[PDB]
Amino acid sequence: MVMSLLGHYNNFFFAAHLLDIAMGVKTLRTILSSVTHNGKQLVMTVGLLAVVVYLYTVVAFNFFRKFYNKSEDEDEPDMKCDDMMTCYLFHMYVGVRAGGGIGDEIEDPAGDEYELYRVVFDITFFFFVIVILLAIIQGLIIDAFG
Amino acid sequence: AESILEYFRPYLGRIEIMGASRRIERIYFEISETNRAQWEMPQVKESKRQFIFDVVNEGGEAEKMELFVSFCEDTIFEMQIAAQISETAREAATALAALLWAVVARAGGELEVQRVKFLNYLSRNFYTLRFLALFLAFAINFILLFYKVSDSPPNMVYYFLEESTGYMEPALWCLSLLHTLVAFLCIIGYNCLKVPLVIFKREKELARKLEFDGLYITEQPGDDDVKGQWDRLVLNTPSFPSNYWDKFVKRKVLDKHGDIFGRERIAELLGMDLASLEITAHNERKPDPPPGLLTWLMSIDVKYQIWKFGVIFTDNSFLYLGWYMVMSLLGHYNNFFFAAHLLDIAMGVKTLRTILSSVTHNGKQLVMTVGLLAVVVYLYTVVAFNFFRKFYNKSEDEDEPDMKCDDMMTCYLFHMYVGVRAGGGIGDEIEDPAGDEYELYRVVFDITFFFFVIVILLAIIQGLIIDAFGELRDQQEQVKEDMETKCFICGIGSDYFDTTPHGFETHTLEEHNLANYMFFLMYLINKDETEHTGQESYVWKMYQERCWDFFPAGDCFRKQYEDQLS
Ligand SMILES: Nc1ncnc2c1ncn2[C@@H]1O[C@H](COP(=O)(O)OP(=O)(O)OP(=O)(O)O)[C@@H](O)[C@H]1O
Ligand SMILES: [Ca+2]
């Protein structure tokens, strides 16, 4: 009722009705219920992913400052390593997505210093929050529907 | 007589044993109310849960009852030990952090006496100290989330830039000072509370091994286990049974094997030399030596102290707490070392401990699979090292100082670091094979590389870790459910008891209940041997002789008397 009434506010609020109804045929209601059926462990797993990404953020904050830049010529006003908050946001928003961890969006480690101290960082980041953690999260929701 | 029966319902306790008649018999006794009151303690219930999960899951049906009786013997110990208790980004960050914390809390000479008075307070409330430690770690990390680095001091300076509010800067200092103390309190509480359990367990196990076996006198020590060797340094001490009840157990071993072997050798191996003095001590009377308080108390068994310290340090929980200590201490090195605490604690809620254990649960094949992936990538590296040199370059104009094909080491590193990741094998990061030469000799290389180390090998590795977690969940579910379809004492399930309504509740609540035996074992202790009934002494004799035939194991008063009582 209230959304239908607010629809006459000259807006698209009518676009929020289809949903509620679309979920009338069970085979979709079960899907919608699967999200919260097993959420008590889903929230813990999400928290674990968040703390692992934060751990990597603080590891790379005071060791790999000179890599996190967006490669702008003659000036680098954008550095995602100076503040802890911006670095954490950048990791949590870019590294999780992408194919492969934060090895596709930062400078090449071809430089002599810390090369072997960052190749392992990239590999373990790709191995611990992409091929296991996201796999587990996707598995939990899909398996509950089954 | 309904009223008296109802009043006396929570005291009478039924058990069922068989023996000397080859038929099931009933027993009755009185359950003291203090024991029932102390039964529902926070530690006791979780210990029972852990014990039942361990017994049902780790395989049984042969030593099950022996482990049951052993658990009873151990749990009596802390039932005793319980006696000593008498008296913008910031807007988003706060909202998200509060949600995470909320769900975690939803599932998380005469002057020396005052020292003991204050120290006994820690053992009473021990879990809350750990709760406070987790809370402090959370708060200090959330404060840490506001750091910044500048090229000049306010040579890089890690100056902490707070918000417009000038507060919360010294709060970091005070919280850092407070966290170390509230973790040291946890350490002291653990050293005061839990270590008697493990010490007593080891003492009891050694006493059982010596009494009913000659592993340290007759045949040989196993000489292959650190636990089975480090204990050789305590046999000579005069105070070996420090916490076990049998404080004169040394007599039994020499009385059982001191004749078949060298009696002097036996009486010298176990310390306690000159057994004539021990024999003649109980001849005239019991003298009372004068007290030597605070004068000769320094003289203590050095060997026993060393052995106890070894048993302490070989443990895992205490080592974990000490690791927490050392990291907290190193935190005051003006660093982020406080960021390594959240973890250890975060893994407190099981549903995460199972995930953490799944990584190493099946690692014995995981390492082999990783090695196989490494050798396959190396094989492709040596295949492409002497055939496809002119492709591996980073496309720099007018000069190519960077070639990842010249050295074998650089080529292998480049493959192992780039090709595995990426979507598709090494076909997205090197030159196009459109050139006429070797085109069909490299298209197949790219395709097979994408097919053999990406869509199979990584899939297998991801499958192994994920599936193990599923197996762990299934194991926990099965250990929860199996106990709901059997009795853990009877050798039969719920199907036969379900022929009548509430049959299983009747077979589990008033008949053998897994808790009536708990009261029975310590009720036998209180009543002197002269007052034992015609059956109490019967079971007590076997219990002292370690024969578990008196458990029913197959039928409980109903299969025997089906026709007479249906
Ligand atoms: N032989 C048995 N002894 C005890 N409980 C049994 C037995 N067989 C089945 N059960 C089931 O186990 C329940 C008690 O054991 P459980 O491990 O669940 O105890 P708990 O976790 O302390 O809590 P609660 O007693 O409320 O279930 C009984 O209520 C019954 O449903
Ligand atoms: Ca008598």
Coordinates of N, CA and C in Angstrom, one line a residue, chain B residues 73-164:
Chain B
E73 N 36.3 -40.4 36.1 CA 37.4 -40.2 37.0 C 38.0 -38.8 36.9
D74 N 38.2 -38.3 35.6 CA 38.7 -37.0 35.5 C 37.8 -35.9 35.9
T75 N 36.5 -36.0 35.6 CA 35.5 -35.0 35.9 C 35.3 -34.8 37.4
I76 N 35.5 -35.9 38.1 CA 35.5 -35.8 39.6 C 36.5 -34.8 40.0
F77 N 37.6 -34.7 39.3 CA 38.7 -33.8 39.8 C 38.3 -32.3 39.7
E78 N 37.8 -31.8 38.6 CA 37.4 -30.4 38.7 C 36.1 -30.2 39.4
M79 N 35.2 -31.3 39.6 CA 34.1 -31.2 40.5 C 34.7 -30.8 41.9
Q80 N 35.8 -31.4 42.2 CA 36.5 -31.0 43.5 C 37.1 -29.6 43.4
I81 N 37.8 -29.3 42.3 CA 38.5 -28.0 42.2 C 37.5 -26.9 42.2
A82 N 36.2 -27.1 41.9 CA 35.3 -26.0 42.0 C 35.0 -25.5 43.5
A83 N 35.5 -26.3 44.5 CA 35.3 -25.9 45.8 C 36.0 -24.5 46.1
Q84 N 37.2 -24.3 45.6 CA 38.0 -23.1 45.9 C 37.4 -21.9 45.2
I85 N 36.2 -21.6 45.4 CA 35.5 -20.4 44.9 C 34.8 -19.6 45.9
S86 N 34.9 -19.9 47.2 CA 34.2 -19.2 48.3 C 34.7 -17.7 48.4
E87 N 33.8 -16.8 48.6 CA 34.2 -15.4 48.7 C 34.4 -15.0 50.2
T88 N 30.5 9.9 4.8 CA 32.0 9.8 5.0 C 32.3 8.4 5.4
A89 N 33.6 8.1 5.4 CA 34.1 6.8 5.8 C 33.8 6.5 7.3
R90 N 34.0 7.5 8.1 CA 33.7 7.3 9.6 C 32.3 6.9 9.8
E91 N 31.3 7.5 9.2 CA 30.0 7.2 9.4 C 29.7 5.7 9.0
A92 N 30.3 5.3 7.8 CA 30.2 3.9 7.4 C 30.9 3.0 8.3
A93 N 32.1 3.4 8.8 CA 32.9 2.5 9.6 C 32.3 2.1 10.9
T94 N 31.7 3.1 11.6 CA 31.1 2.8 12.9 C 29.9 1.9 12.7
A95 N 29.0 2.2 11.7 CA 27.8 1.4 11.5 C 28.2 -0.1 11.2
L96 N 29.2 -0.3 10.3 CA 29.6 -1.6 10.0 C 30.2 -2.3 11.2
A97 N 31.1 -1.7 11.9 CA 31.8 -2.3 13.0 C 30.8 -2.7 14.1
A98 N 29.8 -1.8 14.4 CA 28.8 -2.2 15.4 C 28.0 -3.4 15.0
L99 N 27.7 -3.6 13.7 CA 27.0 -4.8 13.3 C 27.8 -6.0 13.5
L100 N 29.1 -6.0 13.2 CA 30.0 -7.1 13.4 C 30.2 -7.5 14.8
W101 N 30.3 -6.4 15.7 CA 30.5 -6.7 17.1 C 29.2 -7.3 17.7
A102 N 28.1 -6.8 17.3 CA 26.8 -7.2 17.9 C 26.6 -8.7 17.7
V103 N 26.8 -9.2 16.5 CA 26.6 -10.6 16.2 C 27.7 -11.5 16.9
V104 N 28.9 -10.9 17.2 CA 29.9 -11.7 17.9 C 29.5 -11.9 19.3
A105 N 29.1 -10.8 20.0 CA 28.7 -10.9 21.4 C 27.4 -11.8 21.5
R106 N 26.6 -11.9 20.5 CA 25.5 -12.7 20.5 C 25.9 -14.2 20.4
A107 N 27.1 -14.5 20.0 CA 27.5 -15.9 19.9 C 28.9 -16.2 20.5
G108 N 29.5 -15.2 21.1 CA 30.8 -15.4 21.7 C 30.8 -16.3 22.9
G109 N 54.4 -13.0 57.1 CA 53.8 -14.3 57.3 C 52.3 -14.4 56.9
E110 N 51.5 -13.7 57.8 CA 50.1 -13.6 57.6 C 49.7 -12.7 56.4
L111 N 50.6 -11.8 56.0 CA 50.4 -10.9 54.9 C 50.3 -11.6 53.5
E112 N 50.9 -12.8 53.4 CA 50.9 -13.6 52.2 C 49.5 -14.1 51.8
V113 N 48.6 -14.1 52.8 CA 47.3 -14.7 52.5 C 46.5 -13.9 51.5
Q114 N 46.6 -12.5 51.6 CA 46.0 -11.6 50.7 C 46.3 -11.9 49.2
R115 N 47.5 -12.4 49.0 CA 47.9 -12.8 47.6 C 47.0 -13.9 47.1
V116 N 46.7 -14.9 47.9 CA 45.8 -16.0 47.5 C 44.4 -15.5 47.4
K117 N 44.0 -14.6 48.3 CA 42.7 -14.0 48.3 C 42.4 -13.3 47.0
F118 N 43.4 -12.5 46.5 CA 43.2 -11.8 45.2 C 43.4 -12.8 44.0
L119 N 44.3 -13.7 44.1 CA 44.5 -14.6 43.0 C 43.3 -15.6 42.8
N120 N 42.6 -15.9 43.8 CA 41.4 -16.8 43.6 C 40.3 -16.1 42.9
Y121 N 40.3 -14.8 42.8 CA 39.3 -14.0 42.1 C 39.3 -14.3 40.6
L122 N 40.5 -14.5 40.1 CA 40.7 -14.6 38.6 C 40.0 -15.9 38.1
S123 N 40.2 -17.0 38.9 CA 39.6 -18.2 38.4 C 38.1 -18.2 38.4
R124 N 37.4 -17.4 39.2 CA 36.0 -17.4 39.3 C 35.4 -16.9 37.9
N125 N 35.9 -15.7 37.5 CA 35.5 -15.1 36.2 C 36.7 -15.1 35.3
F126 N 36.8 -16.1 34.5 CA 37.9 -16.3 33.5 C 37.5 -16.0 32.1
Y127 N 36.3 -16.4 31.7 CA 35.9 -16.2 30.3 C 35.7 -14.7 30.0
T128 N 35.2 -13.9 31.0 CA 35.0 -12.5 30.8 C 36.3 -11.8 30.5
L129 N 37.4 -12.3 31.1 CA 38.7 -11.7 30.8 C 39.0 -11.8 29.3
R130 N 38.8 -13.0 28.7 CA 39.0 -13.2 27.3 C 38.1 -12.3 26.4
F131 N 36.8 -12.2 26.9 CA 35.9 -11.3 26.2 C 36.4 -9.9 26.2
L132 N 36.9 -9.4 27.3 CA 37.5 -8.1 27.4 C 38.7 -7.9 26.5
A133 N 39.5 -9.0 26.4 CA 40.7 -8.9 25.5 C 40.3 -8.8 24.1
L134 N 39.3 -9.6 23.7 CA 38.8 -9.4 22.3 C 38.2 -8.0 22.1
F135 N 37.5 -7.5 23.0 CA 36.9 -6.2 22.9 C 38.0 -5.1 22.7
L136 N 39.0 -5.2 23.5 CA 40.1 -4.3 23.5 C 40.9 -4.4 22.1
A137 N 41.1 -5.6 21.6 CA 41.7 -5.7 20.3 C 40.9 -5.1 19.3
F138 N 39.5 -5.3 19.3 CA 38.7 -4.7 18.3 C 38.8 -3.1 18.4
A139 N 38.7 -2.6 19.6 CA 38.7 -1.1 19.7 C 40.1 -0.5 19.2
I140 N 41.2 -1.2 19.6 CA 42.5 -0.6 19.3 C 42.7 -0.7 17.8
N141 N 42.2 -1.8 17.1 CA 42.3 -1.9 15.7 C 41.5 -0.9 15.0
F142 N 40.2 -0.6 15.5 CA 39.4 0.4 14.9 C 40.0 1.8 15.0
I143 N 40.7 2.0 16.1 CA 41.4 3.3 16.2 C 42.6 3.3 15.3
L144 N 43.3 2.2 15.1 CA 44.4 2.1 14.2 C 44.0 2.4 12.8
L145 N 42.7 2.2 12.5 CA 42.2 2.4 11.1 C 42.3 3.9 10.6
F146 N 42.9 4.8 11.5 CA 42.9 6.2 11.1 C 44.4 6.7 10.9
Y147 N 45.3 5.8 10.7 CA 46.7 6.3 10.6 C 46.9 7.0 9.2
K148 N 48.1 7.5 9.1 CA 48.6 8.2 7.9 C 50.1 8.3 7.9
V149 N 50.7 8.5 6.7 CA 52.1 8.7 6.6 C 52.4 9.9 5.8
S150 N 53.3 10.7 6.2 CA 53.8 11.9 5.6 C 55.3 11.9 5.3
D151 N 55.7 12.6 4.2 CA 57.1 12.7 3.9 C 57.9 13.6 4.8
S152 N 57.2 14.5 5.6 CA 57.8 15.4 6.5 C 57.1 15.2 7.9
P153 N 57.9 15.5 8.9 CA 57.3 15.4 10.3 C 56.2 16.5 10.4
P154 N 55.2 16.2 11.2 CA 54.1 17.1 11.4 C 54.5 18.5 12.0
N155 N 62.9 8.9 6.1 CA 62.5 10.1 6.9 C 61.0 10.2 7.0
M156 N 60.3 9.2 6.5 CA 58.9 9.1 6.6 C 58.4 9.0 8.0
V157 N 57.4 9.8 8.4 CA 57.0 9.8 9.8 C 55.6 9.2 9.8
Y158 N 55.4 8.2 10.7 CA 54.1 7.6 10.8 C 53.2 8.4 11.8
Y159 N 53.0 9.7 11.5 CA 52.2 10.5 12.4 C 50.7 10.1 12.3
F160 N 50.1 10.0 13.4 CA 48.7 9.6 13.4 C 47.8 10.8 13.4
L161 N 47.1 11.0 12.3 CA 46.2 12.1 12.1 C 44.8 11.7 12.6
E162 N 44.3 12.2 13.7 CA 43.0 12.0 14.2 C 42.0 12.8 13.3
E163 N 40.8 12.8 13.7 CA 39.8 13.6 13.1 C 39.9 15.0 13.6
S164 N 38.9 15.9 13.3 CA 38.9 17.2 13.9 C 38.9 17.2 15.4

